[PDB]
Design a protein around this ligand. Structure first.
Ligand SMILES: [Ca+2]
Ligand SMILES: [Ca+2]
Ligand SMILES: [Ca+2]
Ligand SMILES: [Ca+2]
Length: 511
DNA sequence: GTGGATGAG
DNA sequence: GCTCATCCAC
């Protein structure tokens, strides 16, 4: 065409962390450390990524390495079942707390699969610690925060990156990058760079057409192109290619410094990014161009239920409520309401109003349908761009134990368990303090139990600190007092042995 | 006040 | 299957 399909406004928008995600030109990444717990144990025990390791808790498998999966092992399997699929399996049990001890510890060469009765990790007196995974995640997150100025911690093993600044800055100012032996970005993109510093454009003006010398710019990773479309046809393509390069370097850092492999989804929107990181794994990168967004969504592997918020009960409700076919529901949503979000909105209002349609258990806000339609309209088209957003502050933290057998028959027994809970909540407060770079101190403690016959007892109250700071010993002390008060409360009633015991902290001052 | 429902996979 | 934090009809 004569001009690009994009404006200067939308390009310059890339350079503002608050608005960059709204640009059609946005370059978002979703990076997943797959089989995270297995990777962490592999690296700790000096093993390779091709070693069939399985992370184990009790008799179940919680993480399965991709090497282990070659043998048909899945989380579905027990350790005994997985060992009949691959006798060379390397099960590694999580760290555990022992009842009464204030620290966790690894019991290597111990597990329910080893014959020696000496080398067991009894479920009855032990509690699992996920601290080693928390810590490793923290190391990753610091390396991500180092390479990019807007990182969302989507979960323990997944982040989103907004690569707009980085990309926009490469595009305009990076005089070091070279496409070939003789070709450099500064020469190839001299026209866009001279126009931009010149300042003579109107922001709403369309961009200049991309130069031919940019078409040799290489994507890093696997560009999803079923229909064999051209790789670089406009500026959104240029930014994305740059992103993939930047994104590869970041992932190599994770591998170089910590040894973890990742999958990466690169695209304009967060939901499309997450689909792509999962599309091939492990150690892979998938780029989804804007012009392939419909090729990607329609490939066959996705349905309306594949999206972040639609994976569960609300997802089903929509299939029902929108009479969507059990295949190509996304496409089906595009064509039925082809022109605008509102068409979906009115339909919803009509279905919204029906005798069969519940109002009581409905996961659908009647007031909030305006947005629900726009979400779906745009999600169906791969243009639903949310901002990268910090997770809100914690309100509650809990550490409990499901007790079986008669281990818990006394106040003394309960107190041994509280020690483990305190130990654990202390290390979790610490993870939080680093995440926030702020002191976190809880003012309220709650002690909960379930009796022999599954009745619930509970006691909340303040915890006081002799110092300005938080001290685990003051949390325990209050816990002990509550546990003791509940003992008296249950004297000639159904009580021991307990079947469940827990500690919860709330009312944090993030001073 | 909170048991139960809910999200991912 | 499980997890744990978070939300809200009861
Ligand atoms: Ca994952
Ligand atoms: Ca002790
Ligand atoms: Ca995960
Ligand atoms: Ca185009």
């Amino acid at each position: 065409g004569r001009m690009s399909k994009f404006t200067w406004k939308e390009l310059i928008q890339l350079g503002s962390p608050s608005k960059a995600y709204e640009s059609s030109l946005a370059c978002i990444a979703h990076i997943d450390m797959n089989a995270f717990f297995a990777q962490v144990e592999q690296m700790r025990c000096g093993l390779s990524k091709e070693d069939p390791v399985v992370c184990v808790q009790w008799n179940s498998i919680i993480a399965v390495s991709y090497a282990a999966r070659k043998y048909g092992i899945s989380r579905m399997d027990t350790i005994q079942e997985a060992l009949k699929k691959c006798s060379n399996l390397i099960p590694i049990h999580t760290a555990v707390f022992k009842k009464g001890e204030d620290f966790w510890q690894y019991h290597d060469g111990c597990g329910s699969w080893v014959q020696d009765p000496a080398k067991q990790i009894s479920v009855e007196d032990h509690k699992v610690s996920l601290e080693p995974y928390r810590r490793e995640s923290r190391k990753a997150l610091k390396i991500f925060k180092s390479a990019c100025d807007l990182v969302e911690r989507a979960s323990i093993d997944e982040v989103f990156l907004d690569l707009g600044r980085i990309c926009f800055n490469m595009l305009m100012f990076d005089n070091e990058y070279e496409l070939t032996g003789d070709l450099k970005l500064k020469d190839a993109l001299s026209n866009i760079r001279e126009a931009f510093i010149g300042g003579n454009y109107d922001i709403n003006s369309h961009l200049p057409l991309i130069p031919e010398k940019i078409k040799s710019l290489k994507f890093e990773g696997d560009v999803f192109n079923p229909e064999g479309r051209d790789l670089i046809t406009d500026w959104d393509d240029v930014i994305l290619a740059l992103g993939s390069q930047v994104c590869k370097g970041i992932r190599d850092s994770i591998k170089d410094i910590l040894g973890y492999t990742t999958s990466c989804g690169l695209s304009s929107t967060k939901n499309v990014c997450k689909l792509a990181s999962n599309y091939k794994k492990p150690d892979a990168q998938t780029i989804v161009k804007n012009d392939c967004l419909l090729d990607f969504l329609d490939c066959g592997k996705f349905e309306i239920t594949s999206f972040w918020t639609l994976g569960g009960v609300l997802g089903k409700e929509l299939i029902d409520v929108l009479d969507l076919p059990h295949e190509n529901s996304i496409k089906h949503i595009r064509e039925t309401w082809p022109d605008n979000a509102g068409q979906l909105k009115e339909f919803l209002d009509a279905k919204v109003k029906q005798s069969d349609y519940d109002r009581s258990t409905s996961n659908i806000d009647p007031l909030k349908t305006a947005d629900l339609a726009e979400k779906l309209f745009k999600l169906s088209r791969g243009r639903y761009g949310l901002p990268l957003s910090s997770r809100p502050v914690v309100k509650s933290m809990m550490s409990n134990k499901n007790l079986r057998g008669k281990s818990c028959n006394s106040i003394v027994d309960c107190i041994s368990w509280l020690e483990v809970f305190c130990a654990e909540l202390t290390s979790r407060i610490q993870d939080l303090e680093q995440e926030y770079n702020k002191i976190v101190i809880p003012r309220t403690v709650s002690i909960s139990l379930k009796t022999k016959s599954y009745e619930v007892y509970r006691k909340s109250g303040p915890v006081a600190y002799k110092g300005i700071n938080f001290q685990s010993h003051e949390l325990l002390k209050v816990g002990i007092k509550f546990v003791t008060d509940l003992d008296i409360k249950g004297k000639n009633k159904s009580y021991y042995p307990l079947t469940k015991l827990s500690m919860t902290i709330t009312n944090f001052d993030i001073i």
